[PDB]
Design a protein around this ligand. Sequence first.
Ligand SMILES: [Cl-]
Ligand SMILES: [Cl-]
Length: 137
Amino acid sequence: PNFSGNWKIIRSENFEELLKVLGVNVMLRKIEVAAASKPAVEIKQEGDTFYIKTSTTVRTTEINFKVGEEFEEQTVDGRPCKSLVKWESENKMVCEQKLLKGEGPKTSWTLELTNDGELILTMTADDVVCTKVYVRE
Ligand SMILES: [Cl-]
Ligand SMILES: [Cl-]
């Protein structure tokens, strides 16, 4: 499955709750919810090498990684971390994150491309799971 494309959101659950359990204050949560309501996601996949750009009114994030090689990014609440992505199946990857400085909840994310061509992102902080679903433009 090729993840490459421009993706637009169709469903989102538990995003504000995920930020809440990470301790993000309500003003900042509502700003993130606003931003997240109209995102653009662009992915370029070349085999195990990925570029993913996520753009909203508050920021543009770009990550470049190769499956199986550590890279640096930020947690969903903005903390710098080392990340490592591995395949769980031919359609789904899972990323484990470790903070660069300090301690905090265990955070991770996953990305799956379904047989129906939907992209499902999950983001987890300990027991709380946010799921966002996208379709390819
Ligand atoms: Cl992502
Ligand atoms: Cl972020």
